[PDB]
């Protein structure tokens, strides 16, 4: 039980990290930076025509609960 | 039948895998040394990674375990395709099967039997590819297959379909013997044999 919970948590965390990485590299087109505040700028992308946004917000909601 | 089912299943799986690998019936590159194949294996045995062979052997072992209630002998044949002649015969005895604990001891016995089998197979000459294939033969006590379809077998679930497809997949049929060590444990009283030429 505990091992399965840990595995699920690790999968969710890896998915969230991959989504954050791809969104940050996507916003790199505008910021042209890779350091800090890049994810902060990319954290406001509310484009409803991109499926990565829905997956990212779903992962965030799942991690917040 | 509570726990000997899985143990006999993994034993037959390792048996078939080692037989197929050490006799060069399939390319060794398709085999990999592993320990988990949906069941904890007692030794790092070379198991194939092909889907068709996987469920093929799975259904074979399932039918064998279902018929175990009347089967007392299980043989794996190795025959050539240019001529339908038996070249090698590996026998696995099931004398009364000690039918109706310490799983580590069962795993140790299975490991010893598999090591004896590998030692016996290592002394055989190299076997070539190109249609050096294998078969399967069983010996029951009192049973008759191929006659359950006399009422059209109106199906209602998956169990009946599996029973029908298992009872219909069998067809009736008609040197240096080398004995090996089997499993001398209480619940699993299994013996091993072998044939050549």
């Amino acid at each position: 039980t505990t091992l399965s919970f840990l595995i699920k948590k690790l999968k969710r965390q890896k998915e969230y990290q991959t989504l954050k990485t791809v969104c940050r590299t996507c916003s790199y087109r505008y910021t042209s930076d890779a350091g800090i505040e890049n994810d902060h700028i990319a954290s406001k992308c509310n484009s409803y025509d991109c499926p990565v946004f829905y997956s990212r917000v779903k992962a965030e909601r799942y991690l917040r609960d | 039948n509570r726990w000997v089912e899985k143990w006999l299943r993994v034993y037959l799986k390792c048996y078939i895998n080692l037989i197929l690998f050490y006799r060069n019936v399939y390319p060794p590159q398709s085999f990999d040394y592993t320990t988990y194949q949906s069941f904890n294996l007692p030794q790092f045995v070379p198991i194939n990674r092909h889907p068709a062979l996987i469920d093929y052997i799975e259904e074979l072992i399932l039918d064998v375990l279902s018929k175990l209630t009347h089967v007392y002998r299980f043989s794996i044949c190795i025959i050539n395709k240019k001529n339908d002649l038996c070249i090698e015969k590996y026998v696995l005895d099931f004398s009364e099967l000690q039918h109706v604990i310490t799983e580590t001891e069962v795993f140790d016995e299975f490991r010893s039997s598999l090591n004896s089998l590998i030692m016996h197979l290592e002394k055989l000459p190299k076997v070539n590819d190109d249609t050096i294939t294998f078969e399967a033969v069983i010996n029951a006590i009192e049973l008759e297959l191929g006659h359950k379809l006399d009422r059209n077998r109106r199906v209602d679930s998956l169990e009946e379909k599996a029973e029908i497809e298992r009872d219909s997949n069998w067809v009736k049929c008609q040197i240096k013997l080398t004995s090996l060590v089997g499993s001398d444990v209480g619940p699993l009283i299994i013996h091993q044999f072998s044939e050549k030429l």
């Binding site: 890896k14 989504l19 087109r29 930076d33 | -």
Partner: protein, 460 residues
Amino acid sequence: LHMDALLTKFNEDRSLQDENLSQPRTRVRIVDDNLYNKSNPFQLCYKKRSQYYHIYQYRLKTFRERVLKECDKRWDAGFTLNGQLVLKKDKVLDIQGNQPCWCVGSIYCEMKYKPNVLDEVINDTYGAPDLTKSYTDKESDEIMLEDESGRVLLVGDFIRSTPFITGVVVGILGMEAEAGTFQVLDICYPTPLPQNPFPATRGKIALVSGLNLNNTSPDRLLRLEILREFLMGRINNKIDDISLIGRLLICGNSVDFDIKSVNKDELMISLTEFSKFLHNILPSISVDIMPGTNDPSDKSLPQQPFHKSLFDKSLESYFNGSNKEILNLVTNPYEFSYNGVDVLAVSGKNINDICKYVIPSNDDDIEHRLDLMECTMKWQNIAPTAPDTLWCYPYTDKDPFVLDKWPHVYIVANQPYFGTRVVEIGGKNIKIISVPEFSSTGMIILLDLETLEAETVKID
């Protein structure tokens, strides 16, 4: 000669002495005083769990204050140049003239991402755009200094032969030549941290990492058994020298799997395979367990210890809370005070993530990793890349990754090669050691505590 000749020369000439088996030699006592003292720095509350900007601000302020103090200690008034007088500037836009000036401000570079990791992440996002377009659409290779008021192109030669990563605070002092590009003559670094005094019978420490015990590689188990036999004094037979290894330090990567497709059975098998080795090594030599990037723990840097579970039931006598000096499960970063010697060990995720980028400046060898480690030690920041390494809510108003006290030895693991480097910064002495993986080229590092001399042990 043949193997038979060597066997007849060695086994027949066996001494068969000193093996009393009733009065054995006691291992050298080595105690990590940081076990129960106070203030576990990297121990966070998982239940507590953006704060990245808050952390950025505090880090920038601390770094700015330290850089200002270093400038006051180095570029104080009366530090005249060759011909011109030196001056100070508060804003980056203030330095404009034929006079040298010193200013503080962050560094900004390109720091492009690697293409391998790009496709590796792309293959698992369910319809993401071509990230390769994000780098190719733009027209690159230039270092600038941002001080919240502007950016100036830092052109020069002394910057070329130095490594840099965006987000570092530098107090370089130069002078413009023909445009809005400031030259460089010297480079300043923040004030030196206080270091514990080196103490003046003595033992050694064994460091091993990169085990990666998986259900597919059987050679790893053979190497593990060989290492267990060699540490037990059964292989070398030189008890006078083997008993000097007080404890073993597993830095990380003991179990290696792909979290995408794994079940509970494989992890349990690998943990029980490790448990055996553990049960054979424990009653002879102490052990220090540390997690890693491929271990069943958090993927961020400050990883909590694994658990009380995930080990064989026969190890319950060690998890009773009383026998902690025999086996100690610690976080990923830790500052071990081995008999007064402060050594910091990290899983190597920081250096691996820094190398995961492609910087189009600064001109994967051993010297490059050593230089990156030296820069990390000088910058007093263990994690230079915040979002790729660090996680949310690391600390409140006091970051743990910013260095507060310089250690004696900096131990990094999960590296392809092995190497050492003794760096001198502000009259201090730091010895960086690169621990390689145990799966491929499974070398064993033996670190002494009397002269800080590292030795290697190969196992084939």
